Symmetry: D2
């Protein structure tokens, strides 16, 4: 039951199942995986595709001949399995040169190098068929207040993204960008810390239509925010270009638990929203099998990501299709929320005594919302305990 197929568009980063287990306090617990191995194992589990940072696929500093051979082997694995590559990204965070940032490093020479490294990988992403190019500015930020003038940093960040937009336009590429917010870690505070900040920034770019967000479940939860709500705002803005699915237990370091772990009810409401809205992008997992696990546990954890999505999809669909739930949604006036407040216009509203002088505030205040009954129907559907 709940068996994923490529139809479900489940994708995984090479760096997810390939995470060797090094953490702030501990050495690697697993050997490195050949990307070819990961492609073949993920395909066997029913994944649709993979994603990569440049330096996951091509060791940093590789010669041109080494680069070609790494890409050739990877493409053979994709061809052997039918796996796709819908998204790629740049590693602008691991190498020591990026310790103060890539696009917003205080050192101008580093900013220029970061752009050149990204541009090289955009070309590769396009060659592999990627539709989306993600940017996670994990080193953009500060540990201290004097170190980073945030207005100047935002100017540099806009300049960088504008140059990248000029680049893809000039080459006729169809790829679009997706900015991944995170509030902190590895920097004390990261620039563009939430979906909202990233959405706001995009509106100030020269070609805003080329940019959207890549929100990650656990990153919004690291600020204690409601991930489904943030996804709804991204959808409302037309900017949900990609998504990273995982789990997180609240305000901690980024745990990258398998999807469904962490906040299970938020996972339910997320799947309900994505499916109801008709989100058509990849269901991408940015997760880490815990370092306690051997390779059998790696593949079990990856399989669990997909299984949990599919269970939640079933339960959310049953919730929305249940005539008792539909009745409860009307009892709670969800239908009214979707109607305009004043399609009659401002003057009619100003002239409407029912909106002021003749509005019975105490009668309105007496009406219960019936939200608890609705939420218990939702709980019963999630748990398969209807009756």
């Amino acid at each position: 039951n709940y068996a994923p197929t490529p139809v479900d568009r489940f994708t995984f980063g090479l760096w997810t199942v390939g995470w060797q287990g090094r953490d702030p306090f501990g050495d690697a617990t697993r050997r490195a995986l050949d990307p070819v191995e990961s492609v073949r194992r993920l395909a066997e589990l029913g994944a649709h595709g993979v994603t990569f940072h440049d330096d996951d696929l091509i060791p940093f500093g590789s010669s041109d001949s080494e680069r070609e051979e790494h890409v050739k082997r990877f493409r053979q694995a994709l061809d052997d399995t039918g796996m796709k590559v819908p998204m790629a990204t740049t590693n602008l965070f691991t190498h020591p040169v990026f310790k103060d940032g890539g696009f917003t490093a205080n050192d101008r020479d580093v900013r220029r190098y970061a752009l050149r490294k990204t541009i090289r990988n955009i070309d590769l992403a396009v060659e592999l068929g990627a539709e989306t190019y993600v940017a996670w500015g994990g080193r953009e930020g500060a540990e201290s207040g004097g170190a980073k003038d945030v207005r100047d940093a935002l100017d540099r960040m806009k300049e960088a993204f504008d140059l990248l937009g000029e680049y893809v336009t000039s080459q006729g590429y169809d790829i679009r960008f997706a900015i991944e917010p995170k509030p902190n870690q590895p920097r004390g505070d990261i620039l563009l810390p939430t979906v909202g900040h990233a959405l706001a920034f995009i509106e100030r770019l020269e070609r805003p239509e080329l940019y959207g967000v890549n929100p990650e479940v656990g990153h919004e939860q690291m600020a204690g925010l409601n991930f489904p709500h943030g996804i709804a705002q991204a959808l409302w803005a037309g900017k949900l270009f990609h998504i990273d699915l995982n789990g997180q237990n609240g305000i901690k370091y980024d745990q990258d638990l398998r999807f469904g772990a962490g906040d299970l009810r938020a996972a339910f409401w997320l799947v309900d929203l994505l499916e109801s809205a008709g989100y058509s992008g990849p269901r991408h997992f940015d997760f880490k099998p815990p370092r306690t696990e051997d390779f059998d546990g790696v593949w079990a954890s990856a399989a669990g990501c997909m299984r949990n999505y599919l269970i939640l999809k079933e339960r959310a669909a049953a919730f929305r299709a249940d005539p008792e739930v539909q009745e409860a949604l009307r009892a709670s006036r969800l239908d009214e929320l979707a109607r305009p407040t004043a399609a009659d216009g401002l003057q009619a509203l100003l002239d409407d005594r029912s909106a002021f002088e003749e509005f019975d505030v105490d009668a309105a205040a007496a009406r219960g919302m019936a939200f608890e009954r609705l939420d218990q129907l939702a709980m019963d559907h999630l748990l398969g305990a209807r009756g």
Copy 2:
């Protein structure tokens, strides 16, 4: 020393010093204050002005004659003291009718009433000389996932703000709106939970130039975010129309401590930013003297808000003026951060071997940022311990 004068534009809400001390678990500890008393006492402390919700100035449900008398007494107090009223707002959160929201209540009749209540108070705000009209949507949100369709709620929120913009335009008013984000409390999650989300929303309004943000120190800190960073993004966007100053100890219920309490170093960096950027708006305190205090403690707490701002202003100015700090800022390449990455343009960057083939990444990575020395100069200046 540190004596405030009206020149400093320090303002206070009537509801701040007037808070009677009722909390989730406890009854009022102080009697209600007449707004006339608060105006006269705040003026004696060196405040510049006050702000109000409609229902702070005019008891909810007052007749027209009662409304006139309350306003007349208040205006006499303002005239007697020279106090100004730069900002006003609507109470769309206390009355039970607003239990599911004002502008985004599921019930359409409540949404229409909320708009009419706001419009009435915009007229009053203009008559009192206010330049800014704040909106804090404290009831906009949910405790459960099925209760609020966030895309529909954002449609209703946009409709409401668009109608308000149409209203002020039609009346020829110069007032502008400032949206106050908060992540949670009193709702389980509040819509537009951070500065970023509010900035992003504004960009989708029909007349975006009429709307900015009113960020509150403690509200961003309730999501664990860096308040100075968020203020920098608001300034970068041209949207810092007003600000609420207070203190908060991290991720808790909204404490509304006096300014300077809570995160003292964030208060330092905030004042440094506001003064460096030339922010010209009110320095408004949205705080609550703790319910442990009698009226002498109320006025001491209000005086402390202003005193702490003035101490921090002195220390931040001394930091920026110190030739040793200026040297340290250059050592940390803050000057380079302010220079364009590629004013030479995209093609020149692509052709520049110094940005890629000839970039010595290991030499760049070896350069220290010297951020710790800079931050210890900042600490020494804050504490008055230079030497």
Copy 3:
């Protein structure tokens, strides 16, 4: 299905279903309930009993004749329904006199009054048959560092609890005390902020056997802690005298959501632990129907508390009884965790080359824990998705 019966020992505070809906920003949305009404309605839902603060049952300041009549009516309702009263507590937080604390108020006269108020209610609790007397020191703490010397406050808190222990011993009462930790709210920081701090404090009382803890789900989660882990430590110490069940979404103000809401997987692991350990005390709900609800929603929310406990009980029992789970627990070495490390004793351990010189650390490190497979079996059982 999942129908509670008095056998299940589900109990509710009068103040839970009786919460009128006043919050930091909003007036009451529901009328006050007569305790007689609450007893009869809860009995109809299958509750076993209720609990009370003194001032929930007897209005503060009541005369002796008024006190007798309130108690008489309440006892008739209990007799009419078969409901029990297993626990009572003192309100040492609502009245303004307690603004700086009860037992740890700086003012000695208030500390003495707090003790006398508690003692009067202990007598009543015993007359009503209560086995446990809870103390929630919600006002014990501070908003500022100079206001409360914590060593002195702990001396006063120990003195108070020691006097209460002397009192019950002198009267021959069988009741025991349960201290309820909370980290913050309504004070900026509350003394004894977690289960651990309360357990440690109890060990320093003169008669430690008379005192245990009353942990609350949401309170430990307000510090981001693992509630099942804290309950395990309380059980390990023999100190889980009572428990408060509810839901919470992480590090926020105390939400008091119905049980099962908030962190659903933590609720699952909690029920698994309580049932596995054979906890025999009340399953008490300290929750608040949201102020959006009318009385039908109040009773729906209370029913949901019990329903969710019973669903989780079923799923946890099925998890533990599943031979595939039992196999996975052995694969993960949960059986070994329960065996002594060195029942052979210290000298044998020191002499055992297999524990040092001949321990193959790399072979040990290669063994996977298989925790992900185990956790996905747990998820499948929780969701009823085995297959």
Copy 4:
């Protein structure tokens, strides 16, 4: 000014200034330091001593001859500088064998090895003159609920500490143990997550007098707790055997900022408490110079730890010595808090009409606490802004 001397007992872990800068997302930015270098540089800054994990001083897996040479070189550096070694600890977290724990690993063979590794290092610590042996169980815990039975784990943790106590007693050593709590990171939840939980656990050991706590500023702040309050409870219990000083910005990953950074006012209240209580132990820094820094920044950051302690010590002493502050403390009844509530005894309290029938609750409730004036005096003293 503020120049540290060995008199001040400032100590640093080898792993602090020696941190190479590897984080969850980034490679090392600094070369490894020879412990001899660190001893000599720290001595030049005015440190009193260093501390070590076994594997900081002796590379894991070293032969007996290699171990002797590493220790010999280290002791020569200590002799050359006058530096002391007051504390040592075991690394039971870096090596992959410890991925599920040391003392509470599910695998019994790992638990036995962990004990043998610790015992070997206790012998070395004693030879180097250490008075305290710290245990930070960073791998004791879980990412999932089924993986770790916490009651069984606490049994194993007690068994391990009891064996260590038997060991030191049998050898006649004067060293004592200090348990370091942390709430999470690197495990999803860590056992003994706070000072309170550790204090409570110690009370159940066979020889409780041999064990205390080593609280770390940032670790308690990772649960949003008040670090000075927790230190006060440890002092009240007689269990503050050692302390780790650093900075933290709230509920995040463990930042290990230099002391004084992070929550500056909490640092002030901590120093006030340690000095007022006469804490006589090391002022030990467990911090990490940010990976942005070169070695000059490492030494600047270490110097800043000590400087900030000394500034805060001066300001707290001036606060306590100021006759205006002493008056304000009496106005706030801090003197009364230190007096017994009922030295007259229980019967006298029960018979005292002034404690109940004749207690004027409204007159008591009207008295203000004057805490805001007191706290503003504290702020003025911290900032050197008295006047």
